[PDB]
Amino acid sequence: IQILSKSKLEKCEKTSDSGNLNCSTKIVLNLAVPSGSSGGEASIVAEIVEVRIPPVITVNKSAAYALYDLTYIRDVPYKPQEYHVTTRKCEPDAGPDIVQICERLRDNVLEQTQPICCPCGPQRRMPSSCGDIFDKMIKGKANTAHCLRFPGDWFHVFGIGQRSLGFSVRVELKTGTRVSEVIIGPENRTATANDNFLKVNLIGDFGGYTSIPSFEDFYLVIPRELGANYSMWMLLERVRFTLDGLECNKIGVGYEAFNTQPNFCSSPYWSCLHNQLWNFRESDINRIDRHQLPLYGLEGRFERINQHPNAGPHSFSIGVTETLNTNLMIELRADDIEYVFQRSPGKIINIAIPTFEALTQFGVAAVIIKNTGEVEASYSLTFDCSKGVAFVEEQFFIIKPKAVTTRSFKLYPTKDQAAKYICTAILKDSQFSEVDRAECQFSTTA
Amino acid sequence: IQILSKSKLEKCEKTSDSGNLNCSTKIVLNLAVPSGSSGGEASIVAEIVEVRIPPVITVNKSAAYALYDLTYIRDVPYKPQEYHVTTRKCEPDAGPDIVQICERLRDNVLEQTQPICCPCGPQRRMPSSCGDIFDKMIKGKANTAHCLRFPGDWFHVFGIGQRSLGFSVRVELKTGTRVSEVIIGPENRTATANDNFLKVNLIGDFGGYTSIPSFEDFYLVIPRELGANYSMWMLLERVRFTLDGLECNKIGVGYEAFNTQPNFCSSPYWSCLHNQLWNFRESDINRIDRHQLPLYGLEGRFERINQHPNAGPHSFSIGVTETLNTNLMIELRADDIEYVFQRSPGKIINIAIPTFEALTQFGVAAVIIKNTGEVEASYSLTFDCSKGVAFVEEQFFIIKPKAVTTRSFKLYPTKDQAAKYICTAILKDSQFSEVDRAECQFSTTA
Amino acid sequence: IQILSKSKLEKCEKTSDSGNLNCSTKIVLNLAVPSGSSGGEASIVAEIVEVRIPPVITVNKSAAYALYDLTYIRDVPYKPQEYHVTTRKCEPDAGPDIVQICERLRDNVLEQTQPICCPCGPQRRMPSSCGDIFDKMIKGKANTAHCLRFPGDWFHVFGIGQRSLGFSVRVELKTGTRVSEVIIGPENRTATANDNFLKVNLIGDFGGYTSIPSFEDFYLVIPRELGANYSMWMLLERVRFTLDGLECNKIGVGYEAFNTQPNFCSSPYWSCLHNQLWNFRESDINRIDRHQLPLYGLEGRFERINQHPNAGPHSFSIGVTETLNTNLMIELRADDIEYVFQRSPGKIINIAIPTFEALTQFGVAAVIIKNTGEVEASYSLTFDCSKGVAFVEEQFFIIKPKAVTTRSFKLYPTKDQAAKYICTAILKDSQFSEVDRAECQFSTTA
Ligand SMILES: *[C@@H]1O[C@H](CO)[C@@H](O)[C@H](O)[C@H]1NC(C)=O
Ligand SMILES: *[C@@H]1O[C@H](CO)[C@@H](O)[C@H](O)[C@H]1NC(C)=O
Ligand SMILES: *[C@@H]1O[C@H](CO)[C@@H](O)[C@H](O)[C@H]1NC(C)=O
Ligand SMILES: *[C@@H]1O[C@H](CO)[C@@H](O)[C@H](O)[C@H]1NC(C)=O
Ligand SMILES: *[C@@H]1O[C@H](CO)[C@@H](O)[C@H](O)[C@H]1NC(C)=O
Ligand SMILES: *[C@@H]1O[C@H](CO)[C@@H](O)[C@H](O)[C@H]1NC(C)=O
Ligand SMILES: [Zn+2]
Ligand SMILES: [Zn+2]
Ligand SMILES: [Zn+2]
Ligand SMILES: [Zn+2]
Ligand SMILES: [Zn+2]
Ligand SMILES: [Zn+2]
Ligand SMILES: [Zn+2]
Ligand SMILES: [Zn+2]
Ligand SMILES: [Zn+2]
């Protein structure tokens, strides 16, 4: 937490146009509140002059998350299946004795559920044998039955709309020996406490240097209320789905699309049943087995999934990993202000960077730091690397004197050839002066 | 409008490196100007000491809009149509007497406009009858003619580039009994008034908590210069279009794509003519008939379409529904400053929330508020709901003492089952203290 | 550079909970640092009172760029080619004497590399002649061989992740006649200089009015380590690629997709080989030949490609053309502060606007300006146009007294018909007062 400005201003309240206005001199403060503040790192003490204990203010800010406004579209099956039935005489208006596993649903009769009969032999959809003339003359002409059924798991298809940034700002005030809590957020961004002495107003946020995804042209697939919890949750492009169920080889095929097919008995098996949810889940599994980031699945690429307050099953939100400075304005009924901050030295314990692939993989530099002081203090950490590795953002954090904090950085090299780099981790305190420096051996595999 | 800081600073102008510099002490102010301010809610009076009426400043800000830089690509038809002609002898180089409605355009001859002849009978593109041998021996062999024509409406295809935020900031100055207007925006963000006494500079905007769409991978279709005005205006994905006219079943098909088709007489009717503008318009109509938000059409999902100044037919902009705090800096040639704000009580008249579907629909809470005071004053409104409903952003507005304002909130429940919730609307004044509280019965349909 | 606030604040450092805290009164400054500042335009002189040369501070800021976190997916060929071989007896397990250019790769044997034999004559994939019965009775039955090979150039397919904003802020301090440099950026945003006298902290950025692309659903194709340097670099939609190599007519086709084709000998030539990298490169060439902006190619639409520090071949970044105000906080160990800015008059030399097409093209207004003064000073430029042309953002720049600067504006008309417009260019100094006005004749072609 850093004070942007301290200023004295005479605020005058007006109630009637004809009547007289009453004034009151207040002390307006502009604050930059970063995400992760607790209050135990810095305090703002107010000095009041009357014409006995001074009021102390401590500001706490929670981690940020991005909530996405979901709109329900239509239910979709996980694995649509095509069944082959090698029998004798075939007809779409047949019984289970000659169609076996195919059949037809009567939930009443459905003309699109009935199977399609194709001739026997090779070059056809299903390769079979026509048999002999004498077996054909009694049992009937050999035919293959093809049907579309939807067994197994089902998924919800949601449309990602606007993205909403959410958090909570706790303002603690000590008039004497008694505490008063003020909760400020995007939902409730204006508050007053203890007989109009305090005025907390949330103006906005100071622009970050890392983007938050919008997921504009994507749909979210949620399993109906094997693999991990959010690994089944996928973000797939809108063009990949067939909401009308009239398009082939797209997520959400219908019976009408499959039955109305160009050259059904000539086209290969499993046609009109390609690029489904199982194909996209399997492509992630193959990528995860090779120890790489998934392309569609949520788990692995996003941090803190659905860990937001007032959560639900049909709700989607991702954690904002970047530290954001939130512009807060505290307007006090005092004469002046004193800013009391806490400082405590710290040391870098050990940096753990594992060996990773040339460009298919990225680096993770786990840096654990201990507070060697006696009081809870603010900290800064810069992770500088060689010409090959791209710049990494500075990390802000508050460590208790009896605790440790693990801080990881994503390392991105620009070279293809297996090269050796050197990284220097610089730790700073509430005072922007360096407390400890550390080096680490870094190398990639071709 | 809220004052971030008030500060005295000695500004010194330099003209020559060798020469002497002249100083002047000025009073710099940092302001957070929200969208919707008029000036009648708060005033900033300057106190000048010389070695008679004080100058009063009032700042007005307009509602925000997002303008999209459109680039013309190519014209596209609304409904491309395939015509069937059941005749006798067929040939692509035939006359209108034996091709009827098909024919060919001579705007000169066009080899891609001529129809394609297919054999008679079933299993073909068009189901017909071959007739008898004796009718065939005189009139000719029976054939079906198929042709591609483009009748009806046409549309413009534009590429959405960068998004530009636009608004206007009016700065009113009263030196005596005479007014002076200063218009500040992203186009003109630096101004000075009345012999260098005033200095208005627009630094930037304070980060909002709601996203504005970019429409990156989308194209805008505009009808050529039934349905509503902007309901015909659609935002469709770039992959859905065939700008080259060589791809089948994509928006903007050509004659070449249709003529060069795999197994033309074997493939079903209306092939190469799927997923066109009419299919996307019809899918919106079906969604609107079921009282749900459209997927492609502009009207229904976006507020204030093309209501921006300096508008045109080949221009696109959407209104920014979220209130944005604009960072303005007023630098005055005075000794000090007095901030005179207006306060007027208000009461919640009635909350109107209609019953809506489980997840296919969202809620709208119409809250009408009256200014019970005597002067124009600023207001705040928080709409808190149960654990199931997600957080809604705080609304800022200015109400005249002889007027009312309707304020609607979008309600998003997280549960699928028909549940009953309770919502509490809290109204605040220019003073962040609550003026009126109101409750409402809330329930959804399964 | 503009001072947002100047404030005196007593900062008190705490080391132990039981122990006593030491105070120090500091002078906190809030600054809006725009991109392009050098230091020679304005200086901030500090006045220190002790109980001899004053410290002078000059702040320089570099131009901004947006860096995209690339993740490697798979290699892709530029032009996959299908070869036709008109021979006699054909078989997939044949020798080079009867398959000619087709053959098969043995890098060992590959069952998917072997060609496919199709019957002779018309209506087939390749139109040929079956010859005579007597030529067939000795040489063999006539057949056509079809094979898929990947000759020529190859490309890298990268997944665009998060966007990171990068720049550098230089803080120059003169204690006496000796200089001290402080480099502040998103990587290192906290610094202290000359025995805790200076405290530079980077809070964030002030919201711009122009968007920066995210490229969410796009992939970047880079040629393997004719056309320009970055013209071969393309941004193509994720749906356009077939990473699995199982889909036809999509970027990155495999042998399996081509061999497993519906009615191979019936379908037209070059099938399963459509919509490849060469098709997208050619569509840009045709657009560039007609003097229009490319759709996929990087060069032409984006400014300053890969001109960022710590660059590489597998790195992607675009220059931020919009001027951004960066919120910097300088906290000094002094009693007061004096702001000394430089002012120098300037004149508009000549405006060069070429005649362009109705809506397929956009305008470029090259405005060259000279500093007629004696010292390096800040400048402002507004380019107002008629009702038809949309609003253009104000441009900030610093010109040396012995130099000139060319400033171009993108002009977007809203009318389709060839109309004549009038544009007024207004130049301003460090003082927001107008120095020079200029008009220009403007017209478009239908
Ligand atoms: C902020 O306060 C909440 C309780 O209201 C607490 O759970 C949270 O841990 C505090 N923040 C920090 C960073 O300690
Ligand atoms: C703001 O409103 C929310 C929701 O009603 C509530 O939880 C919070 O405590 C409120 N803040 C204050 C300071 O009362
Ligand atoms: C701001 O001023 C314009 C006239 O310049 C006026 O039309 C507008 O209504 C004013 N804004 C408000 C919120 O009253
Ligand atoms: C800023 O420029 C625009 C366009 O020329 C104009 O409408 C506006 O009045 C200008 N503002 C001032 C303060 O002159
Ligand atoms: C800022 O300083 C660097 C050297 O550190 C210099 O190259 C650059 O030109 C300076 N910026 C400007 C706008 O002059
Ligand atoms: C900040 O860190 C970077 C990388 O180590 C370095 O180049 C820069 O000079 C540092 N800034 C200061 C003020 O030391
Ligand atoms: Zn038998
Ligand atoms: Zn569910
Ligand atoms: Zn498949
Ligand atoms: Zn007859
Ligand atoms: Zn038009
Ligand atoms: Zn259709
Ligand atoms: Zn011969
Ligand atoms: Zn390479
Ligand atoms: Zn092609």
Author numbering:
A (entry chain C), B (entry chain C), C (entry chain C): 25 to 75, 87 to 142, 146 to 263, 273 to 493
What does the publication say?
HAPLESS 2 (HAP2) is a conserved sperm plasma membrane protein that is essential for gamete fusion in a diverse array of eukaryotes. HAP2 is homologous to the viral class II fusion proteins, which fold into an articulated rod made of three β-sheet-rich domains, termed I, II, and III, with the central domain I flanked by domains II and III in the prefusion form. Domain III connects to the C-terminal transmembrane domain via a flexible linker, while domain II bears the fusion loops at the opposite end. The crystal structure of the C. reinhardtii HAPLESS 2 (HAP2) ectodomain (CrHAP2e) revealed that this broadly conserved, gamete-expressed transmembrane protein has the same three-dimensional fold as class II viral fusion proteins. It was proposed that, like its viral counterparts, HAP2 initiates gamete fusion by insertion of fusion loops into the opposing gamete plasma membrane.
AtHAP2e crystallized in the P63 hexagonal space group and diffracted anisotropically to a mean nominal resolution of 2.75 Å. The experimental electron density map of AtHAP2 allowed us to trace 446 out of 469 ectodomain residues, including the region at the tip of domain II that was disordered in CrHAP2. The resulting atomic model of AtHAP2 revealed a trimer in unequivocal postfusion hairpin conformation, as observed previously for CrHAP2. A similar trimerization process occurred in the crystallization drops in the case of AtHAP2 and CrHAP2, which were also set to crystallize as monomers. The AtHAP2 fusion loop features an amphipathic helix (αF) at its apex, positioned to interact parallel to the target membrane by insertion of its nonpolar surface (I171, F172, M175, I176). The insertion mode of the RVFV Gc was shown to involve a lipid head group binding pocket located between the fusion loops and the end of the bdc β-sheet most proximal to the membrane. In the case of AtHAP2, the structure suggests a different insertion mode, as the bdc β-sheet is retracted from the membrane (blue arrow in Fig 4D) at a distance incompatible with interactions with lipid heads. We found that the soluble, wild-type (WT) AtHAP2e migrated to the top of the gradient, in contrast to a triple alanine substitution mutant in αF, which remained in the bottom of the tube, indicating that HAP2 binds membranes and that the bulky nonpolar side chains of αF are required. We found that D173P, but not D173A (which is expected to maintain helical character), reduced HAP2 function in vivo and reduced the ability of AtHAP2e to associate with liposomes, indicating that altering the helical conformation in this region affects membrane insertion. We found that A. thaliana gamete fusion was completely abolished upon mutation of the corresponding arginine residue to alanine (R163A).
